[PDB]
Amino acid sequence: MLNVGATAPDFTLRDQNQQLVTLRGYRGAKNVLLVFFPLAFTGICQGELDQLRDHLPEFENDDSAALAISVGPPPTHKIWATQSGFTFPLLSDFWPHGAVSQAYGVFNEQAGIANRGTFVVDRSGIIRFAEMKQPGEVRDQRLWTDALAALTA
Amino acid sequence: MLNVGATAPDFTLRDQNQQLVTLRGYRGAKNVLLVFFPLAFTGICQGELDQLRDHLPEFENDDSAALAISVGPPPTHKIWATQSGFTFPLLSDFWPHGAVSQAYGVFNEQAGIANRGTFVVDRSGIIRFAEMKQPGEVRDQRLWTDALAALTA
């Protein structure tokens, strides 16, 4: 897993509507919270993304953007997003399979899915926060807002 | 949609506990926040109401009261409220179907559901804040608290 201080691998991925989303596009404009998750329609990250949806104003505003990423293709993310109320971007690290996840050091080579890793990328494209919690343990979202809050005022 | 300056159409609707709630009952006592919503058990509605829930003291206090309104019947709002931890009123604009929603000009004729209409009704019963977003769009709740604050101090 890339650690704090590393330049964040740039990427171009399709969101749930088949639109292209590039990390570079936020450079100089917004800090970016990257939430990698293993698989759509599973218990743990459903709860995790539900928290994100419920606190969206803290993640998607004038100073911050939030991007969820997993290896699933757009149709999968669209169905789940629509059913779950995910109005933020769910990006497909689908083909190449897990290419971005591997570059961030959060890919499970054995199962073929991304681990629950989280990073905050600043306006310079530098990783300023990196998190990877133990299995079965949900991530601390108050932590993400604190991290984001430190990169503003 | 009804706009600021209009008298808010009065109503008497059943809440999730089958108790009668009438809008006029708040006149001369509290400003009322009306949050219409398309349907219970849907994603974006869940997110909006979880946000309201998470910040309830800001909408339900000495100066203000909040009522969420939808076409669903009492049983439907009761289960959703209990599972979601919603302690505020959820009113049934059920039969006649969406009559109140139609009166406020926020009823979606093709789908048979209220759109995301929000209103602030002051102590005289006049609409002081109005907005209507689509079922696929998300509302900015800061606008809600801001308008409620303007009728207080």
Side-chain angles (χ1 to χ4, degrees):
Chain A
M1 184 174 95
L2 287 167
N3 220 308
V4 164
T7 298
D10 198 336
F11 60 68
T12 294
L13 301 174
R14 299 288 187 168
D15 68 23
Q16 61 260 49
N17 298 127
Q18 313 170 67
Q19 306 299 306
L20 303 173
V21 179
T22 293
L23 176 70
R24 189 170 77 277
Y26 300 92
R27 195 190 298 177
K30 299 190 180 166
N31 287 308
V32 179
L33 168 73
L34 293 182
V35 184
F36 288 84
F37 69 89
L39 293 167
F41 314 109
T42 66
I44 292 64
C45 63
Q46 169 80 244
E48 277 179 336
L49 293 191
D50 287 350
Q51 303 178 227
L52 170 35
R53 169 197 64 201
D54 291 5
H55 294 273
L56 202 46
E58 304 197 63
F59 298 118
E60 183 172 287
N61 52 54
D62 297 322
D63 308 305
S64 320
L67 307 176
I69 302 165
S70 92
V71 297
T76 289
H77 292 158
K78 183 176 173 165
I79 295 298
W80 196 42
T82 297
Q83 291 184 5
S84 299
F86 300 160
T87 58
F88 49 82
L90 267 79
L91 311 179
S92 297
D93 192 13
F94 180 72
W95 186 255
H97 197 302
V100 177
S101 288
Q102 287 169 293
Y104 275 80
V106 297
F107 188 69
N108 182 150
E109 196 60 56
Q110 183 167 58
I113 56 186
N115 290 310
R116 284 182 303 96
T118 306
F119 303 88
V120 166
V121 182
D122 64 17
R123 288 184 190 72
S124 293
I126 304 295
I127 285 171
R128 303 286 295 268
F129 170 95
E131 172 193 59
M132 247 282 254
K133 275 300 172 185
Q134 57 165 54
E137 186 64 58
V138 303
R139 288 173 273 189
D140 189 325
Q141 79 118 62
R142 298 169 306 179
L143 239 185
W144 307 341
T145 54
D146 184 353
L148 285 175
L151 313 174
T152 167
Chain B
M1 185 204 83
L2 282 174
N3 217 325
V4 168
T7 303
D10 195 5
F11 58 80
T12 298
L13 297 180
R14 299 285 191 173
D15 67 18
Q16 64 262 54
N17 292 141
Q18 293 284 180
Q19 306 294 308
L20 293 166
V21 176
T22 305
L23 177 69
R24 58 169 173 288
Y26 296 91
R27 290 200 255 168
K30 296 180 162 172
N31 293 304
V32 178
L33 174 66
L34 301 178
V35 181
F36 287 79
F37 66 97
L39 292 174
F41 305 121
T42 61
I44 296 172
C45 292
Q46 184 76 246
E48 291 197 302
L49 298 205
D50 282 7
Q51 282 199 204
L52 200 51
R53 173 197 70 193
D54 289 356
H55 297 277
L56 192 59
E58 295 184 46
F59 306 106
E60 190 170 79
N61 52 52
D62 287 43
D63 301 313
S64 321
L67 308 169
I69 303 174
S70 192
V71 294
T76 286
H77 293 158
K78 171 79 286 192
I79 295 299
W80 192 42
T82 301
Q83 307 190 339
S84 304
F86 295 157
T87 64
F88 50 89
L90 274 78
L91 310 183
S92 297
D93 186 26
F94 177 79
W95 194 238
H97 192 306
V100 181
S101 297
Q102 300 188 317
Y104 278 79
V106 298
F107 190 59
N108 188 136
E109 284 294 310
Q110 61 93 339
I113 54 177
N115 280 313
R116 303 191 184 280
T118 321
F119 300 93
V120 169
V121 181
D122 67 17
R123 298 184 177 90
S124 297
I126 289 301
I127 296 180
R128 298 300 292 278
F129 173 87
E131 77 175 346
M132 178 177 79
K133 265 182 158 55
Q134 284 296 114
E137 310 174 324
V138 185
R139 280 171 287 198
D140 180 1
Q141 293 193 18
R142 306 186 264 310
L143 289 178
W144 302 357
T145 58
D146 279 350
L148 287 176
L151 304 187
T152 295

